[PDB]
Ligand binder design. Sequence first.
Ligand SMILES: O=C(O)c1cc2c(ccc3ccc4oc(C(=O)O)cc4c32)o1
Length: 330
Amino acid sequence: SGPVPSRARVYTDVNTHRPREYWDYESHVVEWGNQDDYQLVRKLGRGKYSEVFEAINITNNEKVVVKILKPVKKKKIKREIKILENLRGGPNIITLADIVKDPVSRTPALVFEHVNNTDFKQLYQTLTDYDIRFYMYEILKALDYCHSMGIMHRDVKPHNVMIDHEHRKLRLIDWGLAEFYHPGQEYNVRVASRYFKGPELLVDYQMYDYSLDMWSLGCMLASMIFRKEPFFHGHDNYDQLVRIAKVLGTEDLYDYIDKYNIELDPRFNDILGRHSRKRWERFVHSENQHLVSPEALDFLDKLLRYDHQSRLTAREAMEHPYFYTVVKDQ
Ligand SMILES: O=C(O)c1cc2c(ccc3ccc4oc(C(=O)O)cc4c32)o1
């Protein structure tokens, strides 16, 4: 017996009650649209697994985004497609409009609703206190939805939260790393993006859950209210934990690993050190003070916990006083 097991505290058993087909994405049969409906306009980016384009649907003259897939593990294709279909129409979830075969790649191309996004680096510099609260609530709607549907996003970060600021519209995108939560399942820790990786990933604890997304959201919040993007700025995955420990303290880190009977990579022996837990006020200064309130700090504090079991759930987060000032729809 190595690690102590763990379970999500909410939506724990949602998938087990489902028909197999809901989560057994390996058996999913892709429904294909017509590639000729779409004309590529310009490349937006390239990752290790895909290329993303702005495009036009020539049938309706509507802008769309086309992601042409190329993953090495090809079962990930069906996983992303099944998750997108399962979640389609949920609050603030990007809509998959079509799936077509690209004639050049001969691979699936996912067609999504367009978002006229403001670049996050520019945008975060302009967010007011009210805006941060507003958009955080919007992200929480999306996360509580997918969690309630038995799905963890696993790549929450600024790029994946597409905001059209002009129209105050938000969409959670790129479900390519998302997975179905099953109690007792051990998951790959090589997920999320460095600055947003939860302590569970960084200590190699595999039996994690929806609460991973809440750590990532906390990292986003900290970057927004303190105007420090990213907040925990590691050079690699090991330094990433050290950066966290310099804020949350090493004593609570050891309490966490001790709770789950986890051992740190011996790598940490001569780099981790001994750090006190810092008060959040440490990160406040004249340039970010207009974004900080006791409610902001308390909310942040309750997201950024080493113990994934201790973090606020998305629904609990929506109950927080931080959101009292936000006008709800509609
Ligand atoms: O990778 C995906 O799945 C993905 C990317 C996007 C998406 C859905 C809508 C989008 C809308 C605007 C964008 O601007 C960029 C940009 O990079 O500037 C990317 C995107 C994406 O899905």
